[PDB]
Design a protein around this ligand. Sequence first.
Ligand SMILES: CCCCCCCCCCC(CCCCCCCCCC)(CO[C@H]1O[C@@H](CO)[C@H](O[C@@H]2O[C@@H](CO)[C@H](O)[C@@H](O)[C@@H]2O)[C@@H](O)[C@@H]1O)CO[C@H]1O[C@@H](CO)[C@H](O[C@@H]2O[C@@H](CO)[C@H](O)[C@@H](O)[C@@H]2O)[C@@H](O)[C@H]1O
Ligand SMILES: CCCCCCCCCCCCCCCCCC(=O)OC[C@H](COP(=O)([O-])OCC[N+](C)(C)C)OC(=O)CCCCCCCCCCCCCCCCC
Ligand SMILES: CCCCCCCCCCCCCCCCCC(=O)OC[C@H](COP(=O)(O)OCCN)OC(=O)CCCCCCCCCCCCCCCCC
Ligand SMILES: CCCCCCCCCCCCCCCCCC(=O)OC[C@H](COP(=O)(O)OCCN)OC(=O)CCCCCCCCCCCCCCCCC
Lengths: 78, 186, 85, 75, 494, 74, 39, 81, 85, 85, 101
Amino acid sequence: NVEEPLGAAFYIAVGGIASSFVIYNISRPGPNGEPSSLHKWFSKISDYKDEWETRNTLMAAALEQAAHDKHLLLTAER
Amino acid sequence: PKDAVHLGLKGAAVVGGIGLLFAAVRTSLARKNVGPWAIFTRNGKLAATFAAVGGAYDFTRAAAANLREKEDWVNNGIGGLFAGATMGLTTGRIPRVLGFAALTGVVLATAEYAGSGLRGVFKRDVDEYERKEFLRKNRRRPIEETLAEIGEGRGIKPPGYYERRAQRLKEKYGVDINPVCADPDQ
Amino acid sequence: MYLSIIILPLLGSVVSGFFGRKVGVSGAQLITCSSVIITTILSIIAFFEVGFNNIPVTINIFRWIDSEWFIINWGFQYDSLTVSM
Amino acid sequence: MAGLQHYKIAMDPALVRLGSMISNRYKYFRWTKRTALVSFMYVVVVPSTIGYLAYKTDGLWDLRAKRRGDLISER
Amino acid sequence: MSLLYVLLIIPIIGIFLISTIDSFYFFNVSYYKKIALITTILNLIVSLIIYILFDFSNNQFQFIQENLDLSFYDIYLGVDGVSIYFVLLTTIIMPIALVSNWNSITNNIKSYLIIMLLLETLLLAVFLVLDVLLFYIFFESILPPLFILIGLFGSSNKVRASFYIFLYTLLGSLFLLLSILTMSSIVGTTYFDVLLKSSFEYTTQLFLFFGIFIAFAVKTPVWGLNSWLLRAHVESPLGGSIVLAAIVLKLSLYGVFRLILPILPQASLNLTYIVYAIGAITVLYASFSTLRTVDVKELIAYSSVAHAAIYLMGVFSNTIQGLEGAILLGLAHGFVSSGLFICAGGILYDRTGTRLIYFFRGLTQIMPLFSLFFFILCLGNAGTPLTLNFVGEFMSLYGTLERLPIAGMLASTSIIFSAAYSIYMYNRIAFGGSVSLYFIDCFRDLTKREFFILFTLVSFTVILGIYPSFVLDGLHYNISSVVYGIEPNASYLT
Amino acid sequence: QYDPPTGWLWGVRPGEKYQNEGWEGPFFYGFWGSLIVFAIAYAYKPDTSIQTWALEEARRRLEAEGILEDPNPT
Amino acid sequence: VVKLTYPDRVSYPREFEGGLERELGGAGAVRAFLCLDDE
Amino acid sequence: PKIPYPKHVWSPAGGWYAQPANWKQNTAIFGLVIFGITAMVWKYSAEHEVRHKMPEPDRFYPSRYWVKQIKDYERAQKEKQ
Amino acid sequence: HEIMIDTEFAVPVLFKLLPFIFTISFSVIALTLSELLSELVIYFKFSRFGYNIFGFFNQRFLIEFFYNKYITNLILNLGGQITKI
Amino acid sequence: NRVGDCFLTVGMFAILWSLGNLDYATVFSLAPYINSNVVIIIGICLLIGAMAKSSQVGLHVWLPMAMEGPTPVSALIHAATMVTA
Amino acid sequence: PTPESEAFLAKKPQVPPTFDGVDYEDNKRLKQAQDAIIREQWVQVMMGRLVREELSKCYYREGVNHLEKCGKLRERYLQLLANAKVKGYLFEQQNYWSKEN
Ligand SMILES: CCCCCCCCCCC(CCCCCCCCCC)(CO[C@H]1O[C@@H](CO)[C@H](O[C@@H]2O[C@@H](CO)[C@H](O)[C@@H](O)[C@@H]2O)[C@@H](O)[C@@H]1O)CO[C@H]1O[C@@H](CO)[C@H](O[C@@H]2O[C@@H](CO)[C@H](O)[C@@H](O)[C@@H]2O)[C@@H](O)[C@H]1O
Ligand SMILES: CCCCCCCCCCCCCCCCCC(=O)OC[C@H](COP(=O)([O-])OCC[N+](C)(C)C)OC(=O)CCCCCCCCCCCCCCCCC
Ligand SMILES: CCCCCCCCCCCCCCCCCC(=O)OC[C@H](COP(=O)(O)OCCN)OC(=O)CCCCCCCCCCCCCCCCC
Ligand SMILES: CCCCCCCCCCCCCCCCCC(=O)OC[C@H](COP(=O)(O)OCCN)OC(=O)CCCCCCCCCCCCCCCCC
């Protein structure tokens, strides 16, 4: 008459389904289009309005000049 | 044109003469007293083999040049093919025949395509700064040059593809191109 | 109902196979048969709902594969033939 | 036998000998009429055949939005 | 200190702590393994933080740090869509590789962990460098740690294996180096943002293509250049094998996106019928050969050859679908082949001490958890749907068929033979009679460790198999940049 | 008649408890743990895929024709 | 045997008014029998 | 008779003749978990079913009671005169 | 492609009831060939013509002997040649 | 069956190649309008896939070999539901 | 028309979809040109996605009458299927063409 306990697999699956239902509902933008409190944080931190555009441009121009200086030295008349 | 037999004889002589050199060193480095006439007795095969490879090589390239009526890298590889084949024939092993032919024909062909500087690379005698700058900034080219190398279709559909597409199909299949309208009202 | 016909045999198969130790032999037979019977009954209604009154039912849940032109969704569609079979 | 003790297996000598012969077989390959033909069939002909068909038919067709009165042949 | 540089620094700190902790505490080996595991966990945590901040539709390289102190050989790091998922796959896989060997090393544990941690920094550097020479420097830097890993911890034939993987890779890479040096000479620089802007002449592109393709064919590997994989991936330690198959095979795939698609598009278009003949040949010859392979890890190693041919055919399709399928199949093969090597090299080889398939039979009877995961991994290796392996195979094969139908049909036939060799192996091991009479001792089923390194791998493939959008959303705009062609009425707007 | 469910999970005999090798801590809380935390943050992540940006433009450009209906005409 | 012994069609093909051209998709699709060649 | 079987093998499907003494209880808890998901799915399918045709009032269409698209239509259609 | 109208009217009555005639007839020969005659069939079985027919149909037209040998084992030998040569 | 699915997979490639997607409401909305040769290429492929899953004379050898399973499996999967896919 | 959302402000191409007039030395403007090429291609293709979507609703709504009522929606997709395809910027960046040829 040994009894089999439910175990941890049952709780993880039910908890995972319950958590998935809970997390999805609270993450919705709501009836209005205004984002959530936590939605605005993840946009403020990842702003990079032109930061990658600025940094990349200077790097490309600097290395283009650097390639130019070597081209001058490497092709100088003997 | 060129004299295939005359060039081969010069080919046979030049690299056979070095074989005669290597044959004398073997005779000189021979331990037992074999006298001076072992240059052609015990090592005559060595000098003979060299004279054969050099003859086969210069004959065939000259011959390949006559047959193709051209002078390019193909002929030295072909020359090296029989040159390599000749050395393999001395061992009497078919894989040795093919493999040494393959080795020689490949090295001697990439040597002529690339033009190894062992005698000196060709000097451009131009502003070498300018060639690099042109190659560096030639970032946009006329579409015709690309169309010559890559052709039409295979996802490369320049403006005006559909008009010439119908013309090509009419010339080959004799079928007019006219897709049907998908609207009943039209 | 239309999407319950989908998941009910799935749930019955997951519990019986991954928890046959928990429900035991009779527990598994009770769930698979019950889930299939409940699913079977709902199909009979769907035959009336779709086949007899001629309402095809479209149900789209979420995109499966989305590349440029291919938009394959986990979408289900009830018409006369699928309720016949 | 290995670094970490495993279970006791009935290591059959015949099967052990078979699995060693396979691992050592490369050392005994030789060029013969048979081995040259098979090695030439698989490495050259069949690949060059596919390369011929791939080359010959590259661009021959496009299926995109083809209709009645319009062929599939592209070249 | 950019997040990308943080990725390369954490595994180096772990090396420092591993090799100095004895001066602060005879230290226990468990300590070293815990330092190494946490080190890889924090590296995974950083790669997840980057992914949250990553933007899916930017043509600028992201999370780049300005150097401006130019030298001859500087290391610039940056990430976009094509590199973001390879970085994630490296950070997910390496913790699993560490756990997969937790109990099976037992000697030179410090050396194993330091080598494993160094390999993480190098492989990540490969996917993050923004320069073509920088790419080569890291693609090759991993050979000596790989050479010493196999020799220190490999099986009986690890000497021949370590030589094969070192010399094959070097010889091919030397031809790739020649092609790379020609590019830097003409352009003056190998930086991505300015080398892609350049335009090489057709015959230059042709000779640049051979040099690069010879290296990528040794690393794919293509059939006939794959002896090194048969030896190395089998003779390697289990962790080595996981890293070798799930990460190192991908470098040539990621390298096709950065070294030939943008700069050699004419050569790629005009030579596809040669790539496809080799790709078609590899799909058939490998599939037939693995059907007759008797070493279980070599069978699983040989499957990698067949699948690598499919995503190699995808990257040369010039289509949006083929390129997305190629990355998704390369990612899918990373999880599934990792699980199959844990099943073979970790579970079976630790119990029996042998890898010959002749000795296994009926393992399902005593080991139902192993068989449950083994079957799901045998389904995924067969391209069964709801695995990320199907989405990648279908998209990769669709591009191959559209670019060139004769190769698509032949590559399609892999749907039969992958199933054929995967299920046939599965039956001779898990099914096919009762438990093999060669086993004297009974076997235990999966330990908690084995269950959770397999459950994790089968979870990733299945969830990504049901919602591949997680990965495709961050590939759509960047994949678009590598396509070469124009439409008749969309080109040249005015 | 039926047998009571038997078997040793993880090989643990009924007498004793599963012993920890030390990987369980970092793996269950560092590896999987961070993998659920990341999943939560992914629900709040802004949508920057090219497709949704393009569907919005495709919508208006279709609303300029008769295929779609403008919610806010003129 | 069947080729030498099989019954000829015992009914003229049915004709639909207007050919059902609009209902089947306009002139760009396949329509039905409408005052067409005998068969 | 019943075939002998190893007692040391743990299978989640239960094994050879597994039937726990608490099988009735566990079969009820799992049924409730099964029921709740179906309710969750039924609520979803009521909300997102799409129909371009509306059933006639007299016909046996039991879905009109729980679906939103028909209920909104019938509620609006009740306003006559 | 509609042929249903001719099915109800154009078809001749003889062919419409023809399957029933064969069904209700050939049953009696089969029912008479057993428990009534019961040896006409064995006489056919032990002839050389019947023995070859019986096996061919019992061996399912041999579409599995040529499959196993000229399709399945061909691939197995192809794999053998590639691994060994 | 996997042989049939290869032909079926190729068939969906031909749908995707010609129509942009393989959703039912699109394929059948454009069916009367596409190249007749395309439809043959399309049509043949899924018939071969249909040939495998319904045991047609070419790929037919699995259904009787598939009678090695328990009898209800033979009744349900191999006699009334899947063979009708 | 649908109002332009805040998201569809930070990713609007400030430049036309072309490479004429772009100085390839200047990185910002070339990158903007490549951005304009790709986004136009994707915008044109999601039109097909919406047309495909509408045709689906039309097809079911019309049933057997789909061959006669959904005609306008059928052709619009077919035109888009004929033209729209993300082909990248790389060809147009590397190959100038002129209509007056
Ligand atoms: C799984 C498939 C199951 C089997 C179904 C096959 C159904 C039939 C399809 C056959 C098909 C589809 C492509 C198959 C692969 C595409 C995608 C693969 C599958 C995607 C998943 C392959 O047909 C190809 O066959 C080639 C053979 O060489 C020919 O190429 C060229 O051959 C030489 C010149 O003809 C060149 O010298 C050579 O240089 C080329 O090479 C061409 O005929 C054609 O390209 C197209 O067939 C159709 O082609 C067209 C033009 O002919 C025909 O139209 C006709 O043209 C007029 C004169 O013809 C007639 O007056 C007119 O009445 C009619 O308008 C059709 O009647 C039909 O024939
Ligand atoms: C695509 C990859 C898989 C994705 C889905 C993953 C599972 C999702 C849920 C599937 C339904 C539940 C299946 C439970 C099966 C019974 C549980 C079990 O494994 O027992 C082991 C059983 C043990 O059951 P047992 O109780 O009889 O064990 C004791 C007796 N012995 C040990 C002798 C057997 O082991 C086996 O006998 C079979 C070994 C292989 C197990 C394969 C089970 C199916 C696995 C999922 C198949 C998914 C199909 C996906 C189709 C894809 C479609 C495109
Ligand atoms: C092997 C599985 C294969 C799956 C393939 C993909 C699915 C296709 C087959 C299933 C078809 C139906 C899928 C389920 C549809 C409904 C999901 C659901 O539960 O939605 C309800 C919940 C809230 O509804 P909401 O989305 O907010 O509606 C308003 C939004 N406009 O919406 C939610 O977001 C809640 C999410 C809850 C968690 C998911 C529930 C899944 C239900 C099925 C579980 C199956 C696995 C069982 C695991 C073991 C259980 C013991
Ligand atoms: C981002 C750019 C990075 C550039 C490189 C920066 C440095 C990278 C690492 C280079 C080498 C660092 C070595 C770190 C370990 C040094 C500390 C140490 O002493 O470890 C000792 C360890 C175990 O030995 P021990 O514990 O003393 O003896 C116990 C016997 N019961 O013994 C060992 O750990 C030895 C481990 C095996 C050898 C290492 C793996 C092969 C390396 C080949 C070296 C040549 C190539 C170098 C490549 C550098 C990275 C590209």
